[PDB]
Amino acid sequence: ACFRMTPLYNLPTHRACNMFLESYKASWILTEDHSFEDRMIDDLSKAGEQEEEEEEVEEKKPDPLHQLVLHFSRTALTEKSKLDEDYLYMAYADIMAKSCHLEVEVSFEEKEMEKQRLLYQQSRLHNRGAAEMVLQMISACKGETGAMVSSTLKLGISILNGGNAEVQQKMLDYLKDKKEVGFFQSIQALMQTCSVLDLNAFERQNKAEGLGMVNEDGTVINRQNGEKVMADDEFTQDLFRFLQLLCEGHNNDFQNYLRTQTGNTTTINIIICTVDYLLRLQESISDFYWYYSGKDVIEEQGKRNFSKAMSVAKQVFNSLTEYIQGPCTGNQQSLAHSRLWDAVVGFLHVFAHMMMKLAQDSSQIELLKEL
Amino acid sequence: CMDILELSERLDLQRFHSHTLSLYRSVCALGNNRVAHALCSHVDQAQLLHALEDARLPGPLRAGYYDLLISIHLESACRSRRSMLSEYIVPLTPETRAITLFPPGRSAEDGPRRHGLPGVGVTTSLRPPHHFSPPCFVVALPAAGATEAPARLSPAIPLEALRDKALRMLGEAVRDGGQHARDPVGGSVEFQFVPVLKLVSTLLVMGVFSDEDVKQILKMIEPEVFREELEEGLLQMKLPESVKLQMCHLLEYFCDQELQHRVESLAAFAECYVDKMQGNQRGRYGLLMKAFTMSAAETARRTREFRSPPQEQINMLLHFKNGADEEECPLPEEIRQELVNFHQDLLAHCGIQLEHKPQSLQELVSHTVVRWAQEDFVQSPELVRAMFSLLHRQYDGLGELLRALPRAYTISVSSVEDTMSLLECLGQIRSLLIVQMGPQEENLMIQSIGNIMNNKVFYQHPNLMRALGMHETVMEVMVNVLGGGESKEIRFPKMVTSCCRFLCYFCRISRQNQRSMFDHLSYLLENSGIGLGMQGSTPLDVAAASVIDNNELALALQEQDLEKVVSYLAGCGLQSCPMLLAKGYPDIGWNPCGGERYLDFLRFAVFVNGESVEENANVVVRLLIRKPECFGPALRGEGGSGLLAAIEEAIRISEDPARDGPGVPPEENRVHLGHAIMSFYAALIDLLGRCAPETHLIQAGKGEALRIRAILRSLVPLDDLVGIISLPLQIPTLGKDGALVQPKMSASFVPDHKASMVLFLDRVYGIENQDFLLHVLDVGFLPDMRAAASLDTATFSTTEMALALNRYLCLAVLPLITKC
Amino acid sequence: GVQVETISPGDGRTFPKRGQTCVVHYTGMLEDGKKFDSSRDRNKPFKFTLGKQEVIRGWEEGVAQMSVGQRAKLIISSDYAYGATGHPGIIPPHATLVFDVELLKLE
Amino acid sequence: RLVYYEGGPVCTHARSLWRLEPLRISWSGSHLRWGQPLRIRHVTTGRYLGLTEDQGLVVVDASKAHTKATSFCFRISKEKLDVAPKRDVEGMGPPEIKYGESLCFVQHVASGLWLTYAAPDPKALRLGVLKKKAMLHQEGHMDDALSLTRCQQEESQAARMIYSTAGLYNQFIKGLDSFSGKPRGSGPPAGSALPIEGVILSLQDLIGYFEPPSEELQHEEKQTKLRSLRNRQSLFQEEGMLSLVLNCIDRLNVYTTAAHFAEFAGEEAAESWKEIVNLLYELLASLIRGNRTNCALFSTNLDWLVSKLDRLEASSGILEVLYCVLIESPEVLNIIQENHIKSIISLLDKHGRNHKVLDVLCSLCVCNGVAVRSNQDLITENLLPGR
Amino acid sequence: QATHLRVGWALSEGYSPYPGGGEGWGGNGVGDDLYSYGFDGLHLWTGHV
């Protein structure tokens, strides 16, 4: 409160120094923006003095970027029980992902030039084994969530953005040539670990926030515990975006492959796995609506959780649309004979009632637009 | 005997002797300083120093002797220093105040492109010294007990002479490589360079080289880049991949020195700037108070800053990166400009703020790594990994500082000695992470834990302890010994007992410490399946300490963890204790002692600060009803005898030997089965009473609260509670002549058992009727009050039963009568 | 017990007394002639205070029996050197030790 | 002899593999059809699922596996519409049943009973048992349908190899026990003949089978071969071939030399004693090499291995086995004792200066970057001071 | 190592001490074999004893 009047000038010099270091790192160093990824990739992708060395050998030696990708591929292919967290791999995967930028009225010429620039940036990586590396790392994670698989998925999305047909072809050829069930087993495990709206977690978070501020912010924890509801929504969106980009452009071969892997000893139906996740998410959203139905106005935190769930649902709908569009008749049949209709029925119920409820207060216009 | 140089042609003897050297290296590996001292008698200092210089020695023997010298004399010190080299505890001394990012130079005192030579200059980060003892095999052998003597230090070897020899040999190797002879020392360039480079790297990391020595090494690496304000450098010579790996190690050391220098410069600037900021805030406060209240609202808005936490004040005062008005940030413009200039200097040093000759360490490393990768398809994965780690550090220099700062910490000059002692103890504990636990290691661990817990810096700098990761290291040691032979009765119980005393206190030191330990709850709950026979503190106690009286953490608890604990409780309620069966106790068919421990962890989770956490209480109640075996054989639906019958049967068991214990004893027979059963049921009733909902929720008529209370009322009848409360206690008496017939508290029915019944009765059923109040007073409370009053004589006043009765009356009974 | 056999003569008068710091150069061997210790290998004289039970009993008696500048061979039985335990990894159990000691100076 | 529904690691072992055998020789590899009668053979034991009038559902021997007892069929549904019969076809036929997708009920043809699970007996779940005895019942439960899952060619080959190898080595052990304690004097061996040639050929074949991959291979290929090798070692160990090899080694170790063996088995048999012993030790090393799980099994019977180091017929092989065990298993390192270390040092004393013995000696000193101070101290105290 | 200095007699056919290694711990001189007989001030040396 007021009378205590805790001034910074009374702190001992070393306590003040530590506080200053924390604050300075948080506000000045962290906020600084340095873009070295493009320069790094450009420097690493250059062979040196090839003519002087007279590399007349038909098989040219890999350049530094190629060797880096090969090293990470070897690490992924090593036979181990689990994939150890590797700060080096995570950093270089982030660098490679950032190297592919994915950047009013834009002229047709400008749009085509941007597409070509992105294609060149993605070819820099997929000409050096990046696609196979991504597949190998996903397989090696063995269904365990974490920073390694998050970085792998982000890299895959970066090299697949725009529906890169060449990358899709390389990935499909690698998968069909290796014939390993590990990749889709890992994908299925990750999809099953993906989370949905949790009302017990929501109530716990509300109570934690309600807990008041008695002591000083340093001594107290500021109740800044990470989000408890849909804490991995970014990972879920990345996983389903990767699956969508595998089929973007109506790639019939890979659309069929996602349903049935003919060459493998066992097959996993990723279309049905996606439908099952959508059903879980729909049930969670229906629970949230029932929780809020009696209340007159949805508060800020409830709106935020609704919005996160709706973004995830949007991504899942886009993934299913990509699976079936073209059309892939096999995928159309597989979806028609699945639990998709129940999910659509539940979603229609929620949509109708949330429309009618949100229309009654203009403070929820953004939520209504998203819905 | 023959000349050892004949092993160049006698290849079987050469192989056997090289493997003998490997065996020497391995019998002393990872801190066996006693065996290193022993090996000093088989390969003496003169032999090792002669082998270092022998140019005719076959390559395997040369490498083996270099490695043997390192293992005997330097490995332990190098490892201990390397463990500490990742933390920056900067004391606020004049040398620290003097440290600056860029060297004071004619071009400018800070800012100029030219860095100082890496690894050369003043560094103030605390690093405990090296400790060695002289080899000598005529001293009297300490005839004290085994596994208790002070740990042996590494045998000493003259370090200044060793440094000079290493430098001279490296220079000779560089010259010879430049000359390109046909008889390399050791038979190959790799066998000529790798050993001396390994020795030099070890000595560098140990930090024994002086500034002149470091300058010589830098000039050997690259004469042009590291010229001081022949011409062929190691980095520019053609070398095998192993030599490139050693060069990468040297470059790693120098890059680490640059990072440390940046951290220390930042700390020094932080000291100066924070002093200026505090001095300015003092003046602003003085002027604000002196003001004759222009506007009360203005005064309140101004003091809004000074009535805020210091961390928030600092954040507000440092929020002028993109400009700010004197109201948003009252910091003066001059003080802002100082920080702006320092930030520019830091960016320039890291290279962020913007010649084929490198001219700098960063550019040299980048060019070298890229050139190697361009020149060859590197075959060694270790070399590839080192190359690209170095390249990443060069390209992202600000990120390295950002990831290093969490491990930086400033301390006052008066804390330096105690911090050094604490660092030595932590070094010993960390060294114990690479050796199978034994008696000597157990004693060392216990002593180090005691010293740390007696050190003041442990209590005053919990953030420093967390940054050092003390809790994680101690937890890892404890879990190693626990997991090792999990089925077998775990050895070294005393070490695990200390492993709480330390950690189970670490949680209590501060809330952030509690949160950090809570982050490992599943780990502790995973390893908590064993214990009991501990008869001390346990990982389950660590788990309870993490969630104790902390509302935020109790709410952050996970249903998975609660389900794990409930499953353990179900196991305890279904199976007997193998240890008790072995010791010879009767087979009652379940494990009250373990059940009590698990119920106890649940009680802390359900109730925080004298109130029930509904979120956890409902979950716990539902899990318990879904696994009815958790209620004990008495509360079983079909064959259950009821709580009152269970307690009476337990009393009979206690009275009758041959059913209460083995009947064949350190703690007077250790476990008594009657008391164990009574304690289990008391703990269960206490847990259920604490899971009962709050009166305000009941008044508001919440459906969930009413349902939970109804479930609890159905589980426990009121008549059973009243009967247990009415059961008589054995009071101390005077028989014979002066014979105090005191009940054995640890083996009989005690008031602590009735306290839980009273708690359940008051929280679940509640007293609301005068007739019921009078009935319970007449049958259960008044007799115990009269007994406690009668035990107020001078002889019985301080008896254990009298004190227990006083505690029971003053904690359960009398408060209830006051409420009613 | 310890037997002392002169190798080179000393001064003949200056003997160590209790509480003095004897500085010596020695080479230790087992009875069969195997070397196990030597201060000359480390190139540093060994210093020890007489009467503080720092060294083995055989040394304590033999060096006291010597004069400054004297070199002598000390033959020490097991009970005087290390007894049954020995020095693990260096000296076997029940080993007789032969030392070649030289008393450089007294301080 | 009993059949269970079991879950967990067993789903990757060889005891859960069954061969479907239609009641015909011609076109027995045609597409499986609903209602088509067939036998179900357990691969690793060679026994047939069947209904016995006394024991109910069991696996019977091939000699007792007549069609009435052991003929089963797959049904799409439990409806009583099996009346409609079908004739055989000379060809691959029409595809009816699919892997994974199709859900099939198993019916005993002769009795019409359904393959189901016995009502979970009490106290077994309480102990922790999670396997349900399978039975043949008149009605069954709604969740009786089974899904047919394909197994890898490597797994099926390993299962058949386990079956044949177990048969051969059991016959060998019985042969040895036949004359265990019956000296022949000067007459005939006085026992049953030994399959010496078969045993030798089988041991050589299995050593080649378990050969570790060549070092000069591309990383990917080497990793795949290592994975396959580990899986095969695990399959054999789980089916119990390690115990069989150890039993053979015990029976042959009872004898101290080829002549001592000949005194009981005859000169012809004794001419292969040394070769068989060496091959058995090589197979043991191949079976445990690089396999932490297999190597850890010796922590209980380390004396069994250390006590054989001084046998002169297969010293190098025994040392190789010990080397593999110590290289892979920290559990053995944590139970090593002074007498074991002294035996290993006596190996140096009695066989000469062999660097493999030193390699063994400080495979005991450190393992996976963790040191055992007791082992280090014991080696230092027992090897160095003698000089 | 202590300086070596011995005086005595040796037999022509048989006393051939080569530099370097040899009997015992090397450094073979007078009295280190059974072809030579030496004196060193304190000891009579023969047969390396």
Swiss-Prot record, chain C:
The modification N6-succinyllysine is found at residue 52. PROSITE patterns: FKBP_PPIASE. Keywords: Acetylation, Cytoplasm, Isomerase, Membrane, Rotamase, Sarcoplasmic reticulum. The gene is Fkbp1a. This is Peptidyl-prolyl cis-trans isomerase FKBP1A. Keeps in an inactive conformation TGFBR1, the TGF-beta type I serine/threonine kinase receptor, preventing TGF-beta receptor activation in absence of ligand. Recruits SMAD7 to ACVR1B which prevents the association of SMAD2 and SMAD3 with the activin receptor complex, thereby blocking the activin signal. May modulate the RYR1 calcium channel activity. PPIases accelerate the folding of proteins. It catalyzes the cis-trans isomerization of proline imidic peptide bonds in oligopeptides. Pfam families: FKBP_C (PF00254). Residues 19-107 form the PPIase FKBP-type domain. PANTHER family: PEPTIDYL-PROLYL CIS-TRANS ISOMERASE, PEPTIDYL-PROLYL CIS-TRANS ISOMERASE FKBP1A-RELATED. Its main location: cytoplasm. It is an enzyme of class 5 (isomerase). GO terms for cellular component: cytoplasmic side of membrane; cytosol; membrane; ryanodine receptor complex; sarcoplasmic reticulum; sarcoplasmic reticulum membrane; synapse. It comes from Mus musculus (Mouse). GO terms for molecular function: FK506 binding; identical protein binding; peptidyl-prolyl cis-trans isomerase activity; transmembrane transporter binding.
From Swiss-Prot, chain D:
It is found in: Sarcoplasmic reticulum membrane. Disruption phenotype: Perinatal lethality, due to severe defects in skeletal muscle development. Neonates do not breathe and do not move. Mutant mice show defects in muscle fiber development. Their muscles do not show a contractile response to electrical stimulation. In addition, mice display abnormal curvature of the spine, thin limbs, and an abnormal rib cage. Residues 29-86, 94-151 form the MIR domain. Belongs to the ryanodine receptor (TC 1.A.3.1) family. RYR1 subfamily. Detected in muscle and myotubes (at protein level). Ubiquitous. Detected in diaphragm, skeletal muscle, esophagus, spleen, submaxillary gland, adrenal gland, cerebellum, brain and in testis germ cells. Homotetramer. Can also form heterotetramers with RYR2. Identified in a complex composed of RYR1, PDE4D, PKA, FKBP1A and protein phosphatase 1 (PP1). Repeated very high-level exercise decreases interaction with PDE4D and protein phosphatase 1 (PP1). Interacts with CALM; CALM with bound calcium inhibits the RYR1 channel activity. Interacts with S100A1. Interacts with FKBP1A; this stabilizes the closed conformation of the channel. Interacts with CACNA1S; interaction with CACNA1S is important for activation of the RYR1 channel. Interacts with CACNB1. The gene is Ryr1. This is Ryanodine receptor 1. Cytosolic calcium-activated calcium channel that mediates the release of Ca(2+) from the sarcoplasmic reticulum into the cytosol and thereby plays a key role in triggering muscle contraction following depolarization of T-tubules. Repeated very high-level exercise increases the open probability of the channel and leads to Ca(2+) leaking into the cytoplasm. Can also mediate the release of Ca(2+) from intracellular stores in neurons, and may thereby promote prolonged Ca(2+) signaling in the brain. Required for normal embryonic development of muscle fibers and skeletal muscle. Channel activity is modulated by phosphorylation. The calcium release channel activity resides in the C-terminal region while the remaining part of the protein constitutes the 'foot' structure spanning the junctional gap between the sarcoplasmic reticulum (SR) and the T-tubule. Pore opening is mediated via the cytoplasmic calcium-binding domains that mediate a small rotation of the channel-forming transmembrane regions that then leads to channel opening.
